[PDB]
Design a protein around this ligand. Sequence first.
Ligand SMILES: CCCCCCCCCCCC[N+](C)(C)[O-]
Length: 122
Amino acid sequence: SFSGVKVSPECLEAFQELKLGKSLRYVVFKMNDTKTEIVVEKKSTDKDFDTFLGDLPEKDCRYAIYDFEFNLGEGVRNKIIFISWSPDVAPIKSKMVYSSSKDTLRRAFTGIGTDIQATDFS
Ligand SMILES: CCCCCCCCCCCC[N+](C)(C)[O-]
């Protein structure tokens, strides 16, 4: 592809496990040092949203998938959320690299229920 970015096998496996095995609540992904591959930084079974927030970087970008459960009234449901985490304070170079590499990861995952772009401020 143009980006030349590869999605590590672990990324696919973690996503599949979360979707098919329901044995993971969330996964946080990051670019490797050479910016040639997206890898897994963290995976968790913790259902507490605050714990998830605690695993997101304050000064760097990341991507994440979260198995979101909610109740609208017709039966507890869930949606796999694809998240682009790009803090306002993160270096412009990083925001650019992650923005340019996002589609590579996104197109590798099927079954995404909601796409979220989050820009947190200090
Ligand atoms: C409607 C849900 C929106 C959730 C957005 C999350 C807001 C909390 C941002 C705190 C970021 C956590 N931190 C400092 C450790 O990086």
